[PDB]
Amino acid sequence: SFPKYEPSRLASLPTTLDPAEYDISSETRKAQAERLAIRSRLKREYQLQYNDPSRRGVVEDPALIRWTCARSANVYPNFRPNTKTSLLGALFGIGPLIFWYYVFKTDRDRKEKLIQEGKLDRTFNISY
Amino acid sequence: SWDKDVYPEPPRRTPAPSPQTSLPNPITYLTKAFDLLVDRPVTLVREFIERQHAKNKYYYYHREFRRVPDITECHEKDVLCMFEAEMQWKRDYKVDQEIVNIIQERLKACQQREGESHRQNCAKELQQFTQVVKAYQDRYHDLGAHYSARKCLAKQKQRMLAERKATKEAA
Amino acid sequence: SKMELPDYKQWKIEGTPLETVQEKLAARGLRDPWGRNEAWRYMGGFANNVSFVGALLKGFKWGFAAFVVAVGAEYYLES
Amino acid sequence: GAHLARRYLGDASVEPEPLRMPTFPPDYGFPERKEREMVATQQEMNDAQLVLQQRDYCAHYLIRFLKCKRDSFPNFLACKHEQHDWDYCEHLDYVKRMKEFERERRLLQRKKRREQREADMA
Amino acid sequence: RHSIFAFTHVLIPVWIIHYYLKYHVTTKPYTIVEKKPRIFPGDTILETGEVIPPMKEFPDQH
Amino acid sequence: MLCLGAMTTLFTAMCALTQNDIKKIIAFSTSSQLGLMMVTIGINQPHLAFLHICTHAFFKAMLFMCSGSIIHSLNDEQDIRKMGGLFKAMPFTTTALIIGSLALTGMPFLTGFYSKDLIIESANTSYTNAWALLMTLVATSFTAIYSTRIIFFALLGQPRFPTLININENNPFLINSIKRLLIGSLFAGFIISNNIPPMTIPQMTMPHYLKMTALTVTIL
Amino acid sequence: MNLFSSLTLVTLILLTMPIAAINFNTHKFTNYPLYVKTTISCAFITSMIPTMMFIHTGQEMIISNWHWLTIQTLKLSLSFKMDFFSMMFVPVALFVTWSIMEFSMWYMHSD
Amino acid sequence: DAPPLTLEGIKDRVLYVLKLYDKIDPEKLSVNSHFMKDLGLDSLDQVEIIMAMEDEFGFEIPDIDAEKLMCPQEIVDYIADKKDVYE
Amino acid sequence: AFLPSAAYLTHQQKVLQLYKRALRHLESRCVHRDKYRYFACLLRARFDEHKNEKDMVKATQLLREAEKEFWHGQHPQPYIFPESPGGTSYERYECYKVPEWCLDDWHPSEKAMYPDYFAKREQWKKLRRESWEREVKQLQEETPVGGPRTEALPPARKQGDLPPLWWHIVTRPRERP
Amino acid sequence: ITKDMLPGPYPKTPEERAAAAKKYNMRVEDYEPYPDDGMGYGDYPKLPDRSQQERDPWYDWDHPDLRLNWGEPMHWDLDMYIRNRVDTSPTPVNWNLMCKHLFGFVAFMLFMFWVGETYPTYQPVGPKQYPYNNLYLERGGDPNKEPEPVVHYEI
Amino acid sequence: AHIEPRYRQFPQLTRSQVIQAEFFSATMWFWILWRFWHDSDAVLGHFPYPDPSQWTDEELGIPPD
Amino acid sequence: MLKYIIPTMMLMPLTWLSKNSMIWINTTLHSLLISLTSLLLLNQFGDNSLNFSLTFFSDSLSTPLLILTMWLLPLMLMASQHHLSKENLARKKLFISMLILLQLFLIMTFTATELIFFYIMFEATLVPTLIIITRWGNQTERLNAGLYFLFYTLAGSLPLLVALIYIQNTMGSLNFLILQYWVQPMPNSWSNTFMWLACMMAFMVKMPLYGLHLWLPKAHVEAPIAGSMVLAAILLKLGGYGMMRITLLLNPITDFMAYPFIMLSLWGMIMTSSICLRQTDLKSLIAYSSVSHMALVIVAILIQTPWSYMGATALMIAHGLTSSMLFCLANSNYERVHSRTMILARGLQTLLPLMAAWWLLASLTNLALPPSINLIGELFVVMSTFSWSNITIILMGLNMVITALYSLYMLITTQRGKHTHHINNILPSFTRENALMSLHMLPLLLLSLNPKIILGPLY
Numbered sequence A: 001s002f003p004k005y006e007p008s009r010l011a012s013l014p015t016t017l018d019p020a021e022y023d024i025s026s027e028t029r030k031a032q033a034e035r036l037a038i039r040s041r042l043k044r045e046y047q048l049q050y051n052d053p054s055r056r057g058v059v060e061d062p063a064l065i066r067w068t069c070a071r072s073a074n075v076y077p078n079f080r081p082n083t084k085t086s087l088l089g090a091l092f093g094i095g096p097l098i099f100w101y102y103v104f105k106t107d108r109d110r111k112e113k114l115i116q117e118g119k120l121d122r123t124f125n126i127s128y
Numbered sequence B: 001s002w003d004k005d006v007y008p009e010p011p012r013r014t015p016a017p018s019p020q021t022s023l024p025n026p027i028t029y030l031t032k033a034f035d036l037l038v039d040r041p042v043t044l045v046r047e048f049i050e051r052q053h054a055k056n057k058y059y060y061y062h063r064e065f066r067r068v069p070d071i072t073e074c075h076e077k078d079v080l081c082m083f084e085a086e087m088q089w090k091r092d093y094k095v096d097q098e099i100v101n102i103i104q105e106r107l108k109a110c111q112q113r114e115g116e117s118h119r120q121n122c123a124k125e126l127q128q129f130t131q132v133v134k135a136y137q138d139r140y141h142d143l144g145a146h147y148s149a150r151k152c153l154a155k156q157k158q159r160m161l162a163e164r165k166a167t168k169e170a171a
Numbered sequence C: 001s002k003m004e005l006p007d008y009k010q011w012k013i014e015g016t017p018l019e020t021v022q023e024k025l026a027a028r029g030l031r032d033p034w035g036r037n038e039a040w041r042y043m044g045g046f047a048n049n050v051s052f053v054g055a056l057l058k059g060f061k062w063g064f065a066a067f068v069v070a071v072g073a074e075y076y077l078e079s
Numbered sequence D: 001g002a003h004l005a006r007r008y009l010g011d012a013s014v015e016p017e018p019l020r021m022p023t024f025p026p027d028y029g030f031p032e033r034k035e036r037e038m039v040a041t042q043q044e045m046n047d048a049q050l051v052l053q054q055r056d057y058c059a060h061y062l063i064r065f066l067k068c069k070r071d072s073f074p075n076f077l078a079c080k081h082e083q084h085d086w087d088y089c090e091h092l093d094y095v096k097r098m099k100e101f102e103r104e105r106r107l108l109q110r111k112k113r114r115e116q117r118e119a120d121m122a
Numbered sequence E: 001r002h003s004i005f006a007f008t009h010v011l012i013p014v015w016i017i018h019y020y021l022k023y024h025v026t027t028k029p030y031t032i033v034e035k036k037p038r039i040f041p042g043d044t045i046l047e048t049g050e051v052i053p054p055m056k057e058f059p060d061q062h
Numbered sequence F: 001m002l003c004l005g006a007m008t009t010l011f012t013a014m015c016a017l018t019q020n021d022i023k024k025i026i027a028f029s030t031s032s033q034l035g036l037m038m039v040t041i042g043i044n045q046p047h048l049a050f051l052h053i054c055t056h057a058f059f060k061a062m063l064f065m066c067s068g069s070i071i072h073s074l075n076d077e078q079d080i081r082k083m084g085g086l087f088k089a090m091p092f093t094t095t096a097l098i099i100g101s102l103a104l105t106g107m108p109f110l111t112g113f114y115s116k117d118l119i120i121e122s123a124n125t126s127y128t129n130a131w132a133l134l135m136t137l138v139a140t141s142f143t144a145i146y147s148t149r150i151i152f153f154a155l156l157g158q159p160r161f162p163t164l165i166n167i168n169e170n171n172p173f174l175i176n177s178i179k180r181l182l183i184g185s186l187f188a189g190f191i192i193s194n195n196i197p198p199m200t201i202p203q204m205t206m207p208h209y210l211k212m213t214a215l216t217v218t219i220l
Numbered sequence G: 001m002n003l004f005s006s007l008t009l010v011t012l013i014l015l016t017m018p019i020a021a022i023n024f025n026t027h028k029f030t031n032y033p034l035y036v037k038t039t040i041s042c043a044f045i046t047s048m049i050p051t052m053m054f055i056h057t058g059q060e061m062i063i064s065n066w067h068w069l070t071i072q073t074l075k076l077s078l079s080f081k082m083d084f085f086s087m088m089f090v091p092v093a094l095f096v097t098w099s100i101m102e103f104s105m106w107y108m109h110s111d
Numbered sequence H: 001d002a003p004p005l006t007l008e009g010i011k012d013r014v015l016y017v018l019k020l021y022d023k024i025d026p027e028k029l030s031v032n033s034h035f036m037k038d039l040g041l042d043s044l045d046q047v048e049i050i051m052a053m054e055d056e057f058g059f060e061i062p063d064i065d066a067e068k069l070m071c072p073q074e075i076v077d078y079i080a081d082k083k084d085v086y087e
Numbered sequence I: 001a002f003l004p005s006a007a008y009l010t011h012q013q014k015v016l017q018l019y020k021r022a023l024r025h026l027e028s029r030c031v032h033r034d035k036y037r038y039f040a041c042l043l044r045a046r047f048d049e050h051k052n053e054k055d056m057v058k059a060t061q062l063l064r065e066a067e068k069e070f071w072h073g074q075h076p077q078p079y080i081f082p083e084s085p086g087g088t089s090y091e092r093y094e095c096y097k098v099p100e101w102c103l104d105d106w107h108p109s110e111k112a113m114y115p116d117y118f119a120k121r122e123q124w125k126k127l128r129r130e131s132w133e134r135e136v137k138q139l140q141e142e143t144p145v146g147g148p149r150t151e152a153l154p155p156a157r158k159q160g161d162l163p164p165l166w167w168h169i170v171t172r173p174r175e176r177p
Numbered sequence J: 001i002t003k004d005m006l007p008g009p010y011p012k013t014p015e016e017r018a019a020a021a022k023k024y025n026m027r028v029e030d031y032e033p034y035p036d037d038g039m040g041y042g043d044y045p046k047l048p049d050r051s052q053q054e055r056d057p058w059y060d061w062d063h064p065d066l067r068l069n070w071g072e073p074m075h076w077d078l079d080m081y082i083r084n085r086v087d088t089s090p091t092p093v094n095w096n097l098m099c100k101h102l103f104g105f106v107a108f109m110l111f112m113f114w115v116g117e118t119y120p121t122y123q124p125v126g127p128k129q130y131p132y133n134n135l136y137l138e139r140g141g142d143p144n145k146e147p148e149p150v151v152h153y154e155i
Numbered sequence K: 001a002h003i004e005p006r007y008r009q010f011p012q013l014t015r016s017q018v019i020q021a022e023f024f025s026a027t028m029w030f031w032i033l034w035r036f037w038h039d040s041d042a043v044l045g046h047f048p049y050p051d052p053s054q055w056t057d058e059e060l061g062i063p064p065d
Numbered sequence L: 001m002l003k004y005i006i007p008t009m010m011l012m013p014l015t016w017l018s019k020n021s022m023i024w025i026n027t028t029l030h031s032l033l034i035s036l037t038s039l040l041l042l043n044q045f046g047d048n049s050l051n052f053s054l055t056f057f058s059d060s061l062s063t064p065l066l067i068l069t070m071w072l073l074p075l076m077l078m079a080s081q082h083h084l085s086k087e088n089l090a091r092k093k094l095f096i097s098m099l100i101l102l103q104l105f106l107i108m109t110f111t112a113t114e115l116i117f118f119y120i121m122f123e124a125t126l127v128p129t130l131i132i133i134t135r136w137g138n139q140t141e142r143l144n145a146g147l148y149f150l151f152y153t154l155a156g157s158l159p160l161l162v163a164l165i166y167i168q169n170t171m172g173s174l175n176f177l178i179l180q181y182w183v184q185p186m187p188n189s190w191s192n193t194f195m196w197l198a199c200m201m202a203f204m205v206k207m208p209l210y211g212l213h214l215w216l217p218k219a220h221v222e223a224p225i226a227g228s229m230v231l232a233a234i235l236l237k238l239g240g241y242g243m244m245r246i247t248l249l250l251n252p253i254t255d256f257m258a259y260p261f262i263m264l265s266l267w268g269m270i271m272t273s274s275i276c277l278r279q280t281d282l283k284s285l286i287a288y289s290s291v292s293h294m295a296l297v298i299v300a301i302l303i304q305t306p307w308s309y310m311g312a313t314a315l316m317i318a319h320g321l322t323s324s325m326l327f328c329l330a331n332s333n334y335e336r337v338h339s340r341t342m343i344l345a346r347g348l349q350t351l352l353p354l355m356a357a358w359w360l361l362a363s364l365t366n367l368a369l370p371p372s373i374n375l376i377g378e379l380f381v382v383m384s385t386f387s388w389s390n391i392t393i394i395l396m397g398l399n400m401v402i403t404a405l406y407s408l409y410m411l412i413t414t415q416r417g418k419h420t421h422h423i424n425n426i427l428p429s430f431t432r433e434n435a436l437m438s439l440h441m442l443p444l445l446l447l448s449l450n451p452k453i454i455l456g457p458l459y
């Protein structure tokens, strides 16, 4: 019949085709009620300190500061050197360096060999 | 003006306009309007400026440098003579760069002037360009950003050694 | 500032293809309750539209007449 | 475009390729064949600054057309006779080229016929 | 003041850069290089006055 | 570069076959035209490509002005499924759009005929890639298809815009500029093709089924 | 020769003039789009003249008018090469831009 | 381009498109006429009415506001809010 | 599943949203109006056939099958209104929506060109700062403990006062400034 | 801002997980941190990894352009999943179908262009003939060297 | 004056725009007909195409063997 | 060179005896006078350099750096007078004295003909910079940044001192002209290998090189605005100048010994550029852009061709100007919104149009738009590296994408889109900030007209 749609990393499943949307259990209702309560609390705080006529400045957001501190200043204390991190660091740190060193060394060795034997065309080459 | 021997140009050959129709071309009318409205006031202003310049005259001169002994007659680690030799070598280097520039300008002028017959009518300019480029490459190439008279002398000595050895192989 | 609308009773679906589709739905046992909303689309200056061939040869009559008088003038002026 | 199908779907022993031509001497089958002669000397056509592609065997009407185009300004639509002569000459040259192609094809056909006849006879 | 656009925006730039081209650009060598004029069989040269000879007779196709 | 140009013009034309945004259709049209320019560069016809540039600029710009006129008259509605019956309501835009579509398709003795058809005249009788020639002919047919798709959906049929009608095109600036580009798209191809000097040998000796290939492809 | 180069560089300088005119502005400009459209139409005429001259004669020119930078052997100058391509593409672009700017001064009136 | 709107104009528009509905008697409805209460309509008919509103005024009403408009005056108020009428 | 008024979406709401998007997509596929009317009446009949269904799990299964049908039958590019999200001119004029507090930073020389407007602005700011404490004191006494359970806001209860948190929804910029 | 609001180490005991979920303003059963592989993520939550185009375009956000709310725990790659950048919104057809169709079309066109290059299309004509030894002097040949005289005969 | 916006009916048209549109369409068709009458060769062909099968073996110089 | 040192050292009585309200006016006026005086160093000859005495000299490489430094000091004085407006008068005078001492040390570092004098003041530049960073930096991490910067520099540069004393004991002199005429080739040995490493690693750290750059995204962020100007516009170029000076003596070992380091930049300028695509911080984005540009300078110096040297000079001057302007714009945004994160303040073109124009022009000059001298330097390095090897152009071309891919990105999220609703303290642009932007930018566009004065000593 119809081809079933499967999710991907760059193409998620649609909301309407998700079975978990149609689950009408009371635990899901409690979860959505708690989520709505949290959202209403945060929205009420934001628009209480946002509609203030006295305030002039920036309504600072703890989530933004939390995100910046996690992205920049919290990476090192939560790092432990194991096999995965060491293999990823060695694979992506000194891999391309060795690869490009070998490529450029090979090309320049071939070019110098051709130049010193009078084979490469260097007729009008006077700007280097 | 400039000198025509350094910058050669063939005498031009302009055909006469022999029209075959009765419609007047706008080019002649626009040209007559150009020497009417543009060339006359420009030439009058230039004449006034030239009179003002002829009222007050003064001269300037091209600086001449005498020949100092080069690096081949300089004692090693004797900075007093090597400094003068290196200054002379750098002045010569700049002069040769401008000579090659002049020959390149000659080649481009020949190509543009000849147009669609450039690959036949510009053989002499191309040969001169090839000769001066070969001599510049044999004189100044592969020295580096820290070029000096000693590196040029070493390169020339290596080239003459290679030429003498290659002559000795085929003798 | 002031806008005046036409009569709402003047839109009828008769003659338009909306009558045809309403009759087809009735033959299938259904009805179209929104035909009078777009009965204006097929009635008035928006009815009797040309086809591709009519739109391609727009102004062909005057152009052909101009070509005829031009070729006659070029015939006469040579001799 | 049947020659392409003849060479590609049939066999290429008879169909001449356009890469190198001719594969036969011009004195083969042509007693006293005379060469094409230019009307334009190389000096006058060099001073006319013709394109090297346009420096072909029929540059005389090209020079005439260019002189018409230069001399009839601004009346830019009344040099049709000279360009008609020029592309008529180019059409004649194209006719000569396809005649040479047909000559090569028929000579290759004769080669195939002769070689099969000599293979069957001996 | 009716057509001063044809004066300030046209004629004054023509004057200024014609002065610039005539007295500061063409005085230097190879600044302005022009393709040499086309030469046909049958016209006359202004510079020395030779009439170029006409071309060979056409073995006419038509 | 001949292969790249043929691939580009076929891909963009096939994309433009089923598009519904008018500006997207004209974008794919001009990219297909650029692919044709790449093709005629690839067969050693550069002056024909330059003539095609000078020819194509006129009616491509004019088509975009007509599209902008329809957009402004319908309150920034660019979808082609919400417009129709604009043949009589906007007559000057209709006339200019019809002439522009005919010039883009390659109607004889319009501006495009003086360049685009000549490109095909060199595309058949030359040492070219066979697949590139076949897909550029298919691309030419696709240009015809999407041009009359634009004409049918934008102009002919019955209206689909909202009930409040604010159709107007009576401004001196828009009428004057559309008139200037209409005169250009009518005569500039003829003027330029008869004014430029011959920089190559024109190929005119060819069979009848190669001479009328482009016109037959456009008609089908 | 003198009419040619002068008119071409007049076309270029005339095009670059309104940029300086708007950059040196203090007041609210009395319909600056009309000024730009008039400037581009006049530049179209001024570039139509040497195109006609090239059609008549077949003149191609190169003006290396301002020496910029001598990188030893290499010399870079402000050089304008006007041949078949440049001289036949400038006025078509100017005509198209004239039409486009008139359509813009109608179309973008509420901006 | 873009002629101004007014409250009585948009009210005339919504009423004018409302009497062109075959499920609604034009001699009964008013500007406070409920659909499933005073006119006996259906929820799907309300959805069709909202789509007619969108196709009439050229802008789409979101669903979370389409499920709330129940009288012609409510549609008038929503269009007035979304289009900033009577400045 | 993300609403400011309700925590979730009911079955009837899902069916109505499905009918809306299916009719819009069908209008996209069926550009001509009479053909669209034919197939819209067909879709209305198909939705009315299973209207009086009382088994909830059967209605849910029909809803899921109709969702699969719709996802198989989408237009790859459906029609979007120009101002709706994804449209051609969506959020086009957001560069022109300057907030009103920038008017507080105006120089007195350019403030003198609009005397009556700035007098009205001053009286509006006076009204806002007069009603703000009343609004917040209404907000504390209305909501239950533990924070509000829904994002909905109360109106102006008493007389002579304004609804709470009204300034940024009244003084919002126009659609076409 | 106070020191107990910043992210900390990876939570293991359930009470630290509860305090972390309280810190990030989310439910305890909805808070799933990144796996403890020592990549520096810490206790920052693992969000459902969807772009900002997937959010509701009609619900009024605190940041309407970003489609985000004040105080909401934002994604670890929010600077990656903004509406100006890579989108994860569902497609009408499948991802593998798109990849297979595009790769097949590109491969077929490349193979056909190779086939056409191997088998060209020409005209049944001889080679073009130029006079004066194929324009030997005009092709840049030196006049001092005498070339082999070639000639073309009429047909 | 300006054109007032009509409602569910055909909008007002000036005589000038329809006159100019018909004039330019007639000009296009006149140009096409005139150029096909005069040239008539860029569409149909310029020169006859001699098929190679009718050329004799004498003019091709084919030796009989 | 005494005509510039003495007024710079007399600026301290000028700033210490002035009134409490006219320190800024007097200091800015007299530093602008010194910047005008600085133009007398353009007396350069095609063969010989300009030698003043036994202690000081200035060829055509040091001259643009000197002019840039003495032009940059008034710009710092105008920038750093808003976050120090509430400061105590004595601390204000101490800050101005630190800036004056830093300029004096820099302009006599660029002119020292003897190498150990160059080293002494090259390290005397550490103290005022570090004091400024660790005193007038804002947040907690200024102390760690100062420690990282100081220790990277000193731990890289003590073997440079050892090698220079070894050169003085071996060759017999450290004068640059004598070394120009007494230079001997360095043969192949391990001693010469570590000689090359000791001479190079100090400038490798101060360039910075990729892998030794960890002190840049701290010290460029925690420092104040004037500290950011000196950190991005002189000191990196000071390391480049020292590299150009000291690569003379290390031939021909460099022809292989530069083989790893080039790769460490050729890949490195990719990776750091990619970091700018995923940076949540504006100042960090500018710092990593500086890392990428200076890595390109490192490659240009290491391949040692003339075109690369002129490209390196033009690139250093242009990058100093552009990085200083970008730091000024970021500092203005930080002053207005009181946070450094890039995503907080959006849509500022609707509120601040002229500062948006300055942002656009600075971003255009950042991505090497022709005919700016950024493009001239980048182009010349590209030509030289293409002469070095072919596949290097790939490593150039990809960079030519990614640079724009962050620069316009930096243009969008800070200036385009819908503005942040709750931020309502966006004051109109002052005349001081606009004057600072114009004084940063107009010399760059004017240098695009006559670039031959910044094309190095071998132009």
Ligand SMILES: *C(=O)CCCCCCCCCCCCC
Pocket: D001, D002, D003, D004, F124, F209, F210, F213, F216, J121, J122
């Ligand atoms: C053989 O047919 C030689 C001609 C070139 C190859 C075939 C080209 C076929 C497509 C062009 C003609 C189309 C006619 C409708």
